[PDB]
Amino acid sequence: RFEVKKWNAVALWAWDIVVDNCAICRNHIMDLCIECQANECTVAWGVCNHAFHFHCISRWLKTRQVCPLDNREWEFQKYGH
Amino acid sequence: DCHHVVKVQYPDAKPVRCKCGRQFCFNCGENWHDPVKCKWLKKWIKKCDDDSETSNWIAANTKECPKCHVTIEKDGGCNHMVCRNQNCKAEFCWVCLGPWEPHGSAWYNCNRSRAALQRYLFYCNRYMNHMQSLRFEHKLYAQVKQKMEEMQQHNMSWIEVQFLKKAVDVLCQCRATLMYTYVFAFYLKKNNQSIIFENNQADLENATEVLSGYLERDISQDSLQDIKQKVQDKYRYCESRRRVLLQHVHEGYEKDLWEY
Amino acid sequence: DYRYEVLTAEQILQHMVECIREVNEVIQNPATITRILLSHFNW
Amino acid sequence: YMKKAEARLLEEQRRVQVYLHESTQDELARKCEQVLIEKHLEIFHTEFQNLLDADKNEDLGRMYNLVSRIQDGLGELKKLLETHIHNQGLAAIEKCGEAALNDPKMYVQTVLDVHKKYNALVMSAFNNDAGFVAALDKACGRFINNNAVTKMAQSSSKSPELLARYCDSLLKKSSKNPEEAELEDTLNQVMVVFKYIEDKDVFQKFYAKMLAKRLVHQNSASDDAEASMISKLKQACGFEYTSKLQRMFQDIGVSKDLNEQFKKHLTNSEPLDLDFSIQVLSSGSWPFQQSCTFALPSELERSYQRFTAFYASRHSGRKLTWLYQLSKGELVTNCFKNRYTLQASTFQMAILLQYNTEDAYTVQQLTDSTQIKMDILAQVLQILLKSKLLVLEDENANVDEVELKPDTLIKLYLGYKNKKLRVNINV
Ligand SMILES: [Zn+2]
Ligand SMILES: [Zn+2]
Ligand SMILES: [Zn+2]
Ligand SMILES: [Zn+2]
Ligand SMILES: [Zn+2]
Ligand SMILES: [Zn+2]
Ligand SMILES: [Zn+2]
Known part of the structure; x- marks a missing residue:
């Protein structure tokens, strides 16, 4: 009846994102950015619910202040850990 | 000089190989051009600006028969031209280039400033640079081969020079695909989805240069354990990146994302 | 896939009579007439 | 004839030291070489072939000395060697037939046997010459990538699969407990047979799959063994070849860690009735x-x-x-x-x-x-x-x-x- 003494489960771990390319380096989000790869690389989120690598969106904002999928203004809303 | 007809079930601008040793784009006729479409290749090769001038003449003194599409120069005065090809016996008007049946029958009478120059300069510069390098690949192959022999006789085995050969091959492929990508990046109106592309390709360009550098000088000697690791790590990166570039272009074609 | 094939002048000439046979299977005309007709219609 | 030629060359070098003037040694040596050898290369080549058919590994040394004494005589020897060793290895794994196509151990063992025998021959007889080692390596590549087993299963991607499965069947946790000293050696040999295969990506696919299975099911022989195998794969193909495997390892380590912290925080939560244990994997690395x-x-x-x-x-x-x-x-x-x-x-x-x-x-x-x-x-x-x-x-x-x-x-x-x-x- 009771028949529950022990349980061992297996769970996949993934970022909380809808679709995965980072759309700057075109890598896969879980992989390393185009900079950390030619050798910490967390994920940054946008107030419009867009997600990018951190080192990618950093350089992009260094040059131009537009979220590069929706030609709008950009500011950080949720970092990633 | 080859004499072989390449029969196919369907014309689709895909590449074919002749068995004489050549591979061409069955539709247009040039060498295989993977990211860029045929029409832009033609428009860029006309004014290619550093390989041929007879195209200037052809554009300046010839028209094209609408039916058979061969260049025709006129040295008569009738305007009632008749195409003297093998099986294109069509007749038309030399000026309007339309059919002659009504034309002149009863009453139907026929009668780059500053910025573009700089852009074209930059793009044509890169394109010609890569053309020069792709023309010298024979020298590159022979160079690395002789160097393989030399490094081998000085107490180095055969497997090392094997990895070196593979690296060279990947390098040549990456240049041959940066070529046509520059062409494609000419006819492209600047929007967000174009800065992304023109920013990835610069990085791949730089990596290509670094690898083509590693080879020539740092072949020197007796540093195998590190130089070999560097070169392997550096050509896997280049190959992956160029596949990313091609996939980006084709996805853009699918989703109608570019603007010219 | 992209299925193609490579031929020489002799084989590409014999393929003409091959196509003529294929069409004359159903048209039932002397070979010369079939060749003329098909050649007018861009093969 | 070889023995006598060696003796005669020895003599006529000595003679110049008891009779004649020193500025004749080189010329007399050159002439005696051109006459005793360098005018019978054909019979030498035929005999070399027959010797390779047999196993006399001493006179072959004599022939190496002699033919090397003249200009470029080795040029035919290397090719003849490579040909013979290729044929021997191919026919050697031919005996296995179908029995190999489903027994990785026998296949890899046969390849290793042939390679060891001829490596042993061309390290003593031929003074570990460069070009001769090159001949060995070319032949081994040829007869590892295409052979009876490759033909029967109808691809060239069967040898990497078999080597991956052998390394699997070796690193699992079987009934017997393997001894670390033997395990390290056997992995070191699998690495040889690896470095000869020429399609090193199919091998990574299969090895990643099998490592994933034996890591998830807690069924592995030795963590240091897994780490050593990954380390030498990385050293032989670079940090980009073995990134997925290193992540697939580090996250089982992190999962083992995090379960302890769950136990600690569990002291104040009273888990209802069950021993809970979880493994939290990454998402891009694992093939699930x-x-x-x-x-x-x-x-x-x-x-x-x-x-x-x-x-x-x-x-x-x-x-x-x-x-x-x-x-x-x-x-x-x-x-x-x-x-x-x-x-x-x-x-x-x-x-x-x-x-x-x-x-x-x-x-x-x-x-x-x-x-x-x-x-x-x-x-x-x-x-x-x-x-x-x-x-x-x-x-x-x-x-x-x-x-x-x-x-x-x-x-x-x-x-x-x-x-x-x-x-x-x-x-
Ligand atoms: Zn990064
Ligand atoms: Zn956005
Ligand atoms: Zn990124
Ligand atoms: Zn051809
Ligand atoms: Zn084309
Ligand atoms: Zn015409
Ligand atoms: Zn007109």
């Missing part, structure tokens, strides 16, 4: 797919929600997707007559725990409460009925063959009695 649309039984829900809330605490934004298709536990069965202890997958647990209430459900009834897929239910229920825990309405029917329909009762066989305890109802 999403799920099979499971409905979680009410028994585990408490621990499920407590752990998901705990995980969400220590990290910013992260989404666990539990995959139940590979996750096992333990049941106590305090309902039968002999106090057994069952051990099965979570699917079995859902289906069995259903019968905690009643014992008269049908295939459709089971589908309603556990939301499992049709074929999956078919397989699981078939395996259960194979065991004497669940019986059909019939008693002697070939339950292994007679499939059932949604309107088919399943009877909890109360009279089940295994001979021993701790039954392992799994495939």
Whole structure:
């Protein structure tokens, strides 16, 4: 009846994102950015619910202040850990 | 000089190989051009600006028969031209280039400033640079081969020079695909989805240069354990990146994302 | 896939009579007439 | 003739030191060389061939000395060698025939045997010449990548698969405990046969798959052994070749760590009745797919929600997707007559725990409460009925063959009695 003494489960771990390319380096989000790869690389989120690598969106904002999928203004809303 | 007809079930601008040793784009006729479409290749090769001038003449003194599409120069005065090809016996008007049946029958009478120059300069510069390098690949192959022999006789085995050969091959492929990508990046109106592309390709360009550098000088000697690791790590990166570039272009074609 | 094939002048000439046979299977005309007709219609 | 030629050359070098003037040694040596050898290369080549057919590894040394004494005489010897050694290795693994195509050990052992024999020959007889080693290496590449086994299975991607499977069958946790000193050596030999194969990406696919299996199921011989194998793969192909494997390793380490912190935080939460243990993998590295649309039984829900809330605490934004298709536990069965202890997958647990209430459900009834897929239910229920825990309405029917329909009762066989305890109802 009771028949529950022990349980061992297996769970996949993934970022909380809808679709995965980072759309700057075109890598896969879980992989390393185009900079950390030619050798910490967390994920940054946008107030419009867009997600990018951190080192990618950093350089992009260094040059131009537009979220590069929706030609709008950009500011950080949720970092990633 | 080859004499072989390449029969196919369907014309689709895909590449074919002749068995004489050549591979061409069955539709247009040039060498295989993977990211860029045929029409832009033609428009860029006309004014290619550093390989041929007879195209200037052809554009300046010839028209094209609408039916058979061969260049025709006129040295008569009738305007009632008749195409003297093998099986294109069509007749038309030399000026309007339309059919002659009504034309002149009863009453139907026929009668780059500053910025573009700089852009074209930059793009044509890169394109010609890569053309020069792709023309010298024979020298590159022979160079690395002789160097393989030399490094081998000085107490180095055969497997090392094997990895070196593979690296060279990947390098040549990456240049041959940066070529046509520059062409494609000419006819492209600047929007967000174009800065992304023109920013990835610069990085791949730089990596290509670094690898083509590693080879020539740092072949020197007796540093195998590190130089070999560097070169392997550096050509896997280049190959992956160029596949990313091609996939980006084709996805853009699918989703109608570019603007010219 | 992209299925193609490579031929020489002799084989590409014999393929003409091959196509003529294929069409004359159903048209039932002397070979010369079939060749003329098909050649007018861009093969 | 070779022996006498050697003796004569020795003599006529000595003679110049007792009679003649020193500025004749080179010329006399050159002439005696051009006459004694350098004018009989053809018979030398034929004899060299016959010697290779036999195994006389001493006179071959003499021929090396002699032919090397003249200009470029080795040029035919290298090619003749490479040809013979290729043929020998190919015919050697030919004897295996089909028996190899399904026994990795014998195949890899045969390749290693041929390679060792001729490496041993061309290190003593031929003074470890460069070009001769090159001949060895070219021949070994040729006859590893294409051979009888490659032909029979109809591809050139069978040798890498077989080598990957051999390394698998070697690093598992078998009955015997392997000795670290022997294990390290045997891996070092697998690395040789690796460095000869020319398609080193199929090998990575297969090795990644097998490592994933044996890491998930806690079934591995030695952690230091796994680390050493990964390390030499990296050293032979670079940090980009073995990134997925290093991540696939480090995250099992991190999972083992994090389970302890869950235990610590568990001191103030009183886990209802069960020993919980989880493994939290990355998402790009591992070759696993999403799920099979499971409905979680009410028994585990408490621990499920407590752990998901705990995980969400220590990290910013992260989404666990539990995959139940590979996750096992333990049941106590305090309902039968002999106090057994069952051990099965979570699917079995859902289906069995259903019968905690009643014992008269049908295939459709089971589908309603556990939301499992049709074929999956078919397989699981078939395996259960194979065991004497669940019986059909019939008693002697070939339950292994007679499939059932949604309107088919399943009877909890109360009279089940295994001979021993701790039954392992799994495939
Ligand atoms: Zn990064
Ligand atoms: Zn946005
Ligand atoms: Zn990125
Ligand atoms: Zn040709
Ligand atoms: Zn084309
Ligand atoms: Zn015409
Ligand atoms: Zn006109």
